[PDB]
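Input record (one chain):
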Amino acid sequence: SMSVKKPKRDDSKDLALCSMILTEMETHEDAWPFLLPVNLKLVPGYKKVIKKPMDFSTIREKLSSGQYPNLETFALDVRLVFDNCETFNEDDSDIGRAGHNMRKYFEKKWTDTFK
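The corresponding structure, as predicted from the sequence alone:
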């Protein structure tokens, strides 16, 4: 509250660390469905159904240009990628499986780096 602050958790390396995590996700072999934005002209249903499209390239641009105010808004966009993937893709598809694997991979790096 006013003039009453919890101790300062050091956030000065968060940008660098989110960038390392993102690099690791970019280079994972199962990242291929997620590297670029889904082509809304060429994928029937996607535009109407997926209200907030997100992909790794779009996160990288946002990260590079100061558009994440803190590490939680970064994690929200990463999870949005996988939540979108589960909305549109069957669990038993190559893309569906890719998204489960990547979400697992992310959440471990997230815990190991910050928790």
